[PDB]
Design a protein around this ligand. Structure first.
Ligand SMILES: CC(C)C[C@H](NC(=O)[C@@H](O)[C@H](N)Cc1ccccc1)C(=O)O
Ligand SMILES: CC(C)C[C@H](NC(=O)[C@@H](O)[C@H](N)Cc1ccccc1)C(=O)O
Ligand SMILES: CC(C)C[C@H](NC(=O)[C@@H](O)[C@H](N)Cc1ccccc1)C(=O)O
Ligand code: NA
Ligand code: NA
Ligand code: NA
Ligand SMILES: [Zn+2]
Ligand SMILES: [Zn+2]
Ligand SMILES: [Zn+2]
Ligand SMILES: [Zn+2]
Ligand SMILES: [Zn+2]
Ligand SMILES: [Zn+2]
Lengths: 484, 482, 480
C-alpha cells in the first residue's frame, strides 16, 4: 500500500525524498520544472518519464490534458519510483480535462496507489520497495481539502478492492479452487460485517440448478462447487441490486477440450465472480444507500469420465431445457441458473459479469468490455459511468436474426450458436432466455473476457489480472443512487 | 540367449551346423569364401546377406572396413539365421577399422542382439532353433581379449534387453509400480541397495513439481521415486544417474494429438536406461559408487490434472510457471536432480526422452548432449560414439536462456519461441542445478533413438536401450583418469 | 558511420562531449567511475546502461569479463548515445587477446549505429559521429590500428549484407542482387560475371531453372560470379550462396505466418557478396570465388511441381515432392558450377531449413560436412569471431531417408525428423567424391534474420556468416 498524505502547503515547501512533476501536452513552462536545460540536453520531450538526478525530480509526461491520461501517468511514475531508493515522493494537485477537480484527484490518487501492484508472490527475488509514501501538497498546478479527502477515501477503498480481485484472479488454479473463492468472500464478509451464505452441490440440487451442476460434474469429487451469496444491507436502501458473476476457477473446455495455446490464462475465468466479491467490498466501505447482493457461481469446467457431454440436454432452474453441443460454452450454463437464483431476490437491478466469449475479445479488443441488455437508458448509464471511471466499454446490440441462431431442434434452446459469427451477442441472447419478463428492463450483461486478464502491462494494470468491472460498476451504482 | 563358445581352433576345423562369413568392402578373395562362382552366378555383390545352400555358408556384407558396420552385420546375420533350422553357427575373428578388443566386443554384441525381438504378444511366436555361435579363435586378417569381450557382450546384452523389455512393455502393465519391480529384480540380482519411495516421501521432500505431474493419475497409478545404489569395495568416483520414468505421457490437459501419443509408453526410456546401467555397471564391477535415480509416473488427463497457469514450487525452491502440461518430464527431473544433488555426487548425468525438438534437429537415431563442462561433454561424446551410439553436442547460449523467463514465477516450463526447444529444455534443467554442480552435470536427450518404429543398426522395432552402452563407456573412461 | 579516432593520450585528458565507461562483472572500483554514490543512490548495479547526467558519463555493464559480452555492450552503448545530442564519445581501452578485445570494442561500437530505418518517415540524422579512443589500458598502437581496419571493413561488409537482406522483395530482385554485386566488384576492382537463364540452360542447370519457372517472365534468374584474385594465392576458395530473393514455397505454398520474413531467404547469397568485399579489402592471400544463385520461388501457372523429376547439372535426377524445398535445388546446380573451378575449399551458405532453427534456436548456425578438421576450423574460428555455431553430424540412417523410388534422390526426407541434416545429405549427393573432403555446408536459417534486437544485431538482417567465414579463411591461410 502506498500511503498518501494530504498536506496544507505549497509544493515547494513540502518535504519528501524526491519530487514528481507531470508534463501535460509537452508544456515545460511551469515553475515546478526546475532545470529545463537538463531536459533539453538529454532530449526529453514529455514522452514517458525522465529523472532529473541532481534535483531528484521525476517528470511524467501526460500527452493530453486528460484525466484518463493522468491516471495512467501517475501509475507509471510510481512503478518507476518503486525500483529506486526514495522512501517518499511529493506531488502537487493537477486538473486535467475531465465535477472535474474531484475526478482529477481520484485519478491522481488511484493512479499513484496502483503503481505499486504487481503479482510477484511466487518470484524468489521479490523486494519490498523503499517507497512508502506520497506527499500531496494541496496546491493547484493550475473546497480543495474536502474534495481531496473525498478522492483519497475513494482511492484507498478502490485500490484495496481492485487488489483483492486481482490477487484472487491471479491465484493459480490448484490453489484458487471454488472453496478458495468462498474463503476470500468469507474474509470480505467478516471485514465488512456482511451476511454471507455459501451453498454447496446439495443446495444446487434442491434448487434444481442442473445447468450449473452439469459443468461441475467432471470435477465434483475433486473440487465441489460453491454458490456464494454476499449481502450488504444498510439502514437506508433506495434500491436492491444483484451482482452476478461467473466464478469459473478453471476452464479447460471440458470434453470439448481447449487447445493448449488457448487454455493458458483460464485461471482468469473467475474474473466476473472475483469482480463481484471486490464490488461488495467497495460498495460496503463506500456505504452506498442500497441493498447489494453478490452472487457467484464457482466451479471448474474439467474433463473426465463423469463430465457433461455434447448431446446432453439439461433442465435449467428456470425450466427451459438446454441442448449442449459444446462443453466449452459452460459459463452461460452456470449463469443461467445463477441469474435465476438472483431474480428470486426481486432486485431492482441485475448486472452479471463474465469472461464469457472469445468473440467479444475478437470484436472489441483485449482492453474493452461489452455491455448488453434491453433497457437503453440503463445500458447508457453503465457505459457513461464506466468510461468516466476509466474503463473501456462498448454496447453491443441484440437483434432478431441473431436470436434465431441459438434455436435447438430437440430442446428449448442450444448452448451454442449455429453460426461462427456474433458469438458475444448470441451468448447474451442465450442468457436472455433465462431472464423473466419482469426483469428484462432491469438487466445488464457485461462481457469482460478481454480486459479481466491481459498478458502485459497496460494503463493502470500490471501483467495478468486487472480487476475489470469493479470501477465501472461502482461508478454505475453511485450514479444510479444519485438519481434515486 | 545366444551362447557364444570360444574355441582354440581354426575356422575350417571348428564344427557347427552352418557358417558365417563376412564380406568386407566387397572383398571376396579370402580362403573362407568357399564357392565364389555361386555368388557370381546369383549376383551377390556383398550387399546384405546371402546363403550358400550347398555349403551352408551365410555371407554378410560389411560395406566399409568399419567396426560399427561389423556390429550391425553380425546382428543382421543372426536375425537371418534365427528363422532357419541350424542349431549352431561358426564364425572367425574379424578386425575392422576401429582395436582387436573393440572388434571382438562389436562381433559378440552384434551376434547376441540378433536374437532380440519384442514378440511377447505375438500368437505365432516361435522359439529359435539357433542356440550357439562357435567362435574359432583365428584371425581373418587374442584369447584374453576374446574372454574380456565375451564378458562385456554378455553383460551388455542382458542389460540392453532388460531396458528394451521394460520400455516395450505397454502402459496398462508398465506402471510406475512395475518399473520399481524391475528395479527390485536388478537390485536383488546384483545385491544392490534399493529404496522405493512413494507420494508421501515426495510430499515430505517438497517435490511438488514431480507431484504435480502425477496428480491426474495418483489414485490410479501412484508415483515411484526409485533409488538404486551400487557401492563397490573401491570407489574412485560417486556418480548419480537420473532418469525420466514417464510410463505414459498423454500430454495431460495439453493433450497430445493421436498421431503423437502413440509410442509414449517409451517415455520411460531414460529411467529404464538408468535401471539397465546399474545392472551393467555392477556386473562390470566398475570402481565407482553409482546411484540410479528414477522419477516414475504417468502424465494423464483428468479432473485432478495439474494445469496451464499452475505455479509449482520445486524442491530446490524455485517457482515454475506451467504454460503447457506436456512439458512434464522437465518438472519430474527438476525434483529428481535436486534429490540427486543432495547425495553430493562427483558427476550427475540425466537421461530423458525429453523433447520433440531434439528429434527434429538431430533425427531419430541420435541423442543430444548438453551441459557446461566441455571436457565432460567431450568425454561422453567420444566414449559414446566408440560404444556405437550416435551423439551430438548442442550448445547453450545467453539468448536461448532468456526464452524461459516468466513474468510471474522464477522460470517457465516452456519457451516463448518455437525454436531451440531441446536446448531451452536443457536450460530449464540448468535452473535447478546448483552452482557447485553445474560443472559436474550432463543432460542427455534420448527422445529420438530410445524408441524407433523400424529396425535399425542392432535395434529391433521399438525400444533400443539407448544411453546404456554410451554411459557405460563414459564411466569406464572416466575411471581410467581418476 | 561511426568514426573512430585513436589518440595517444589518457582517458582523462581525452576530450569528447560525453564519456563511455564499462563496468565489468559489477566492479565499480576503477578511477574512471567518477561519481560512485550517484550509482548507489539510483540503484545502478551494472546491468544495462546508466547515464550520469552531471558528468555526462554513460556506464555500460558487462556481466562477465568476456570479450563477446564487451562487443555486445559497446553496441548497446552506441545505440543509446545515438538517440542523444552528444557529437562525440570518449572511451578507454578494455581487455576482457588485446587485438581480439580491440576488434570487439571497435566493431561493437560501430555496429551500434545500424538500424534498418530506410522506410521510416520519422528517421532523423544522428548527432553522434565520433568515438575518441584514448590509448590507455583499463587494466598497443599497432594492435589498435589493426583492429580499426578490421572493424571498418567488417562493419562496411556486414552493413552491405544487412541492407541487401532487409530490402523488401518487390525491390530486392535477382537483378537487384546482381547490381549490389556489381557495385562491390567495381569498388574492389574484382572480376565479375552475371549470367542469365540462357546461360543456365546451356549449362543444363535444370534444378535452378525449375525453381525460377513460375516467375521467369517477371524476374529472371541471375547466376552471380565474383572473383578475387590477389598477387599471391595460397588457396582457391569457392563460396556458394542461396540467393532466394523471395520464397513463397511455390505450389507447396507457405501459410501467412511462415511466409513473412522470407525476403531474407537471400541471406546466404548476400553473405557471399559481403564476404568478397571483406576478403578483398583485407587482402587475404587466396583466390576467392563468390557464387550466388539468385531467383524467387513463386507460385503461378508455370510453376515447377510436386512430382516433377529434374535432371541436375551433375546429372543425378531429383524427384520433387515439395516445391518449398527449393534452396537445395538451386544449390545443387550452383555447387556443380563451383566444383568446375577446381577449388581447394568449398563453403556454402543458405537459409535452408526450418528444422535447423528448431534444433539449434534462432541465434545459431549449423555446420555440416565430412572433413572433421575443416568443420572444427570453421567452428572454432567462427566462435571467436562472435558467431554462434554448432556441428551437426551425418549418419547412414539419415542418408536413406532421401531415397526416391523413381529418381536418383528425393528433394525431401520421408521423415519429419532431422531435416537440416537430410538437407545436408541431399547437397552431398551433388558433391563429387574428390570434393567431399573439401566441403562445408552452413545453414544460417536461424540467425540470418531475426525479428528482434540481439547481440550486435538490430531487428531483421544480421549479416550472419560473414564474420565467421572471414575468420575461417584467415585461419586457414595461416596453416598454408
Ligand atoms: C465455444 C464457444 C461457443 C464459447 C467459447 N467461450 C468460452 O470458452 C468461455 O468459457 C471462456 N471462458 C471465454 C474466454 C475467452 C477468452 C478469454 C477469456 C475467456 C468461446 O470460444 O467464445
Ligand atoms: C510442449 C513442448 C514445449 C515440450 C514437448 N515435450 C514432450 O511432450 C515430452 O514430454 C515428450 N515425452 C518428448 C518426446 C517427443 C518425441 C519422442 C519421444 C519423446 C515437445 O513437444 O517437445
Ligand atoms: C519442405 C521442407 C523439407 C524444407 C523447408 N525449407 C524451406 O522452406 C526453405 O526454403 C526456407 N527458406 C528455410 C527457412 C525456414 C525458416 C526460417 C528461415 C529459412 C522447411 O520447412 O524446412
Ligand atoms: Na482477457
Ligand atoms: Na523415438
Ligand atoms: Na531466421
Ligand atoms: Zn469455456
Ligand atoms: Zn469459461
Ligand atoms: Zn510430454
Ligand atoms: Zn514426456
Ligand atoms: Zn522454401
Ligand atoms: Zn527457401
Amino acid at each position: 500500500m502506498l500511503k498518501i498524505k494530504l498536506e496544507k502547503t505549497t509544493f515547494e515547501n513540502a518535504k519528501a525524498e524526491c519530487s514528481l512533476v507531470f508534463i501535460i501536452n509537452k508544456d515545460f513552462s511551469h515553475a515546478w520544472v526546475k532545470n529545463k536545460e537538463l531536459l533539453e540536453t538529454f532530449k526529453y520531450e514529455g514522452e514517458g518519464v525522465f529523472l532529473d538526478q541532481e534535483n531528484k525530480i521525476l517528470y511524467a509526461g501526460v500527452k493530453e490534458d486528460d484525466v484518463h491520461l493522468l491516471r495512467e501517468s501517475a501509475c507509471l511514475a510510481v512503478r518507476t519510483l518503486k525500483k529506486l531508493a526514495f522512501k517518499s515522493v511529493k506531488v502537487g494537485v493537477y486538473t486535467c480535462g475531465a465535477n472535474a477537480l474531484l475526478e482529477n484527484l481520484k485519478a491522481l490518487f488511484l493512479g499513484l496507489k496502483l503503481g505499486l501492484y504487481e503479482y510477484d508472490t511466487f518470484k524468489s527475488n521479490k523486494k519490498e520497495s523503499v517507497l512508502k509514501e506520497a506527499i500531496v501538497a494541496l496546491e493547484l498546478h493550475k473546497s480543495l481539502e474536502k474534495s481531496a479527502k473525498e478522492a483519497l477515501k475513494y482511492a484507498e477503498i478502490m485500490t484495496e478492492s481492485l487488489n483483492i480481485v486481482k490477487d484472487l484472479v491471479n491465484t493459480p488454479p490448484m490453489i484458487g479452487t471454488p472453496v478458495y473463492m468462498a474463503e476470500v468472500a468469507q474474509k470480505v464478509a467478516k471485514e465488512n460485517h456482511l451476511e454471507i451464505h455459501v451453498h454447496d452441490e446439495k443446495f444446487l440440487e434442491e434448487k434444481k440448478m442442473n445447468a450449473f451442476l452439469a459443468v461441475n460434474k467432471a470435477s465434483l469429487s475433486v473440487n465441489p462447487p460453491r454458490l456464494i451469496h454476499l449481502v450488504y444491507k444498510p439502514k437506508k436502501a433506495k434500491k436492491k441490486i444483484a451482482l452476478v458473476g461467473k466464478g469459473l476457477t478453471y476452464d479447460c473446455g471440458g470434453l470439448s477440450l481447449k487447445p493448449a495455446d488457448y487454455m493458458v490464462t483460464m485461471k482468469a475465468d473467475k474474473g466476473g465472480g472475483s469482480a463481484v466479491i471486490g464490488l461488495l467490498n467497495a460498495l460496503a466501505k463506500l456505504g452506498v444507500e442500497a441493498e447489494v447482493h453478490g452472487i457467484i457461481g464457482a466451479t471448474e469446467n474439467m474433463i473426465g469420465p463423469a463430465a457433461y457431454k455434447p448431446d446432453d440436454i439439461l433442465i435449467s432452474k428456470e425450466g427451459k431445457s438446454i441442448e449442449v453441443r459444446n462443453t466449452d460454452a459452460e459459463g452461460r450454463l452456470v449463469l443461467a441458473d445463477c441469474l435465476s437464483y438472483a431474480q428470486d431476490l426481486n432486485p431492482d437491478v441485475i448486472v452479471d459479469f463474465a469472461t464469457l466469449t472469445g468473440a467479444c475479445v475478437v470484436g472489441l479488443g483485449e482492453f474493452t468490455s461489452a455491455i448488453m441488455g434491453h433497457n437503453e437508458e440503463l445500458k447508457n448509464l453503465f457505459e457513461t459511468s464506466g468510461l468516466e471511471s476509466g474503463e473501456l466499454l462498448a454496447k453491443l446490440p441484440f437483434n432478431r436474426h441473431l436470436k434465431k441462431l441459438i434455436e435447438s431442434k430437440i430442446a428449448d434452446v442450444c448452448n451454442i450458436s449455429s453460426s461462427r459469427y456474433g458469438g458475444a451477442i448470441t451468448a447474451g441472447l442465450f442468457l436472455n432466455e433465462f431472464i423473466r419478463d419482469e426483469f428484462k428492463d432491469k438487466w445488464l450483461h457485461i462481457d469482460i473476457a478481454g480486459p479481466a486478464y491481459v498478458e502485459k502491462e497496460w494503463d493502470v494494470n500490471s501483467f495478468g489480472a486487472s480487476g475489470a468491472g469493479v470501477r465501472a460498476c461502482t461508478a454505475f451504482v453511485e450514479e444510479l443512487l444519485k438519481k434515486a
